[PDB]
């Protein structure tokens, strides 16, 4: 299985003219394109090795289309400010997430299209890609005119069509980076917190994709009391890292064993302090 | 690639 996603962000700057627009594209957990309305290049720019090979007609099309959207978002900030009867002098954020998924067979699984106003659900295209779901009355207005215009047919055309066409292309073009699973480089560190206690911290470094499961076991049995996971943080080199810590009584370190599960690993790992 | 700019906006 694989996935493609684009994330548009549009924020109003009342007093400092034109709203700022930012767009970024991901294949699985790998960013490959970006556009910024404030950036002087005024062009969609590459953010991965395997997209740089695309010709200038690609970069002009992407630029022209993603700029056209920013101009719509700019008017839609006005529209929604009207709908909700909000202050003229208020920064507001229209985020748009859309993209498609392909199975192991390389065939379409499902598509997404979701809009949010000030970081709360506004309107979402349903899984059948022929019907919408509004979050409040303002979005119910948008829903109606989008039903009347048959806007859903546009989104479906992309998600079932040119989304999967170009997702397949990317997953091939850069298969060496995108289909490559880097397994986690694991170790365990000891931190005495008193003369009758200690903190065992189970590390996992430089793994792709970010999907991972760290779990503590005491004498074979699952142990989550005093466990403390942290959000899967990016290494900033394409790879990810995450550690799970547990507080143990002094001189019982052997009993506690950390278990790492990752797509990159054929068999799940088992660690233990010495 | 990106989706074409929304025909009718919100």
């Amino acid at each position, epitope marked *: 299985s694989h996935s493609m996603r684009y994330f548009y962000t549009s924020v109003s700057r009342p007093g400092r003219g034109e709203p700022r627009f930012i767009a970024v594209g991901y294949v699985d957990d790998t960013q490959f394109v970006r556009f910024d309305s404030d950036a002087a290049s005024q062009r969609m720019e590459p953010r991965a090795p395997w997209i740089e090979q695309e010709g200038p007609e690609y970069w002009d099309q992407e630029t*022209r*289309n993603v700029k*056209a959207q920013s101009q*719509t978002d700019r008017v839609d900030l006005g*529209t929604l400010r009207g709908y909700y009867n909000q202050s003229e002098d208020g920064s507001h954020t229209i985020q748009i997430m859309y993209g498609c998924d392909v199975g192991p067979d390389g065939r379409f699984l499902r598509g997404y299209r979701q809009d949010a106003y000030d970081g709360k659900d506004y309107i979402a295209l349903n899984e059948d890609l022929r019907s919408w779901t509004a979050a409040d009355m303002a979005a119910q207005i948008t829903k109606r005119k989008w039903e009347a215009a048959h806007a859903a047919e*546009q989104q479906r055309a992309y998600l079932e069509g040119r989304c999967v066409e170009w997702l397949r292309r990317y997953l091939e073009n850069g298969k060496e980076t995108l289909q490559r699973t880097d397994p986690p480089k694991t170790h365990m560190t000891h931190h005495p917190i008193s003369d009758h206690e200690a903190t065992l911290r189970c590390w996992a470094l430089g793994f792709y994709p970010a999907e991972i499961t760290l779990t503590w076991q005491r004498d074979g049995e699952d142990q989550t009391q005093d466990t403390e996971l942290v959000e899967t943080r990016p290494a900033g080199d394409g790879t990810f890292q995450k550690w799970a810590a547990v507080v143990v009584p002094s001189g019982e370190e052997q009993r506690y064993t950390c278990h790492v599960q990752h797509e990159g690993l054929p068999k799940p790992l088992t660690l233990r302090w010495e | 690639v990106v989706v074409g*700019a929304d*025909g*009718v*906006g919100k």
Partner: T-cell receptor
Amino acid sequence: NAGVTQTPKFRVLKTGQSMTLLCAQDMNHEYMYWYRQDPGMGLRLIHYSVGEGTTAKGEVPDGYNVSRLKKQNFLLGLESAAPSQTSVYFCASSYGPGQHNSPLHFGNGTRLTVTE
Amino acid sequence: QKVTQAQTEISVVEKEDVTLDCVYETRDTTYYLFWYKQPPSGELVFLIRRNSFDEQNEISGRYSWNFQKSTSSFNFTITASQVVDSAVYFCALSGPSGAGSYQLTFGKGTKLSVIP
């Protein structure tokens, strides 16, 4: 809503005289255009404007100039009238980015003649 | 971005079928196609808009539009010609500009002459 009004219906000019074609729309449209229809050629864009304040050169801007003063009104200026500029002129408007798939709404057209 | 209406003038017998050819040419992936009617009077009348994605065939009374994405054409056929169908018909193509604002280029137009 009236749509795209435009004046005058007809007008004659001496070569070198000045005149301003007048167009207004009450549909609160962002885009506004000034086209030029002639036998053999199509609809050739002289000048356009993508919102109040700003304008831009089209296909055949030479000999013309435009004023997007407020949203409603888009003006077309002939400083020095040339026999060339003897044509039919249409004002037009489109909703704007809010509705990208919007068609052009045209005015009822001005017929201009410019004799020596 | 380019639009070609092959035929300059096309006369036809009254109550005979007639097809107004329009071949377009763009690198744009999301675009909108238009047909406009200009009767002798002079006004430009919006007939239909086609989205780049939607199905090829549509039937609206005596009017019918075949949209062949693969041949890159959008042909307009009038079955059982009424004398009132006599007009200059225009084909147009809207795509995003460098600014991120959909502007459209028109064909040179086809003149239909429905002889009773």
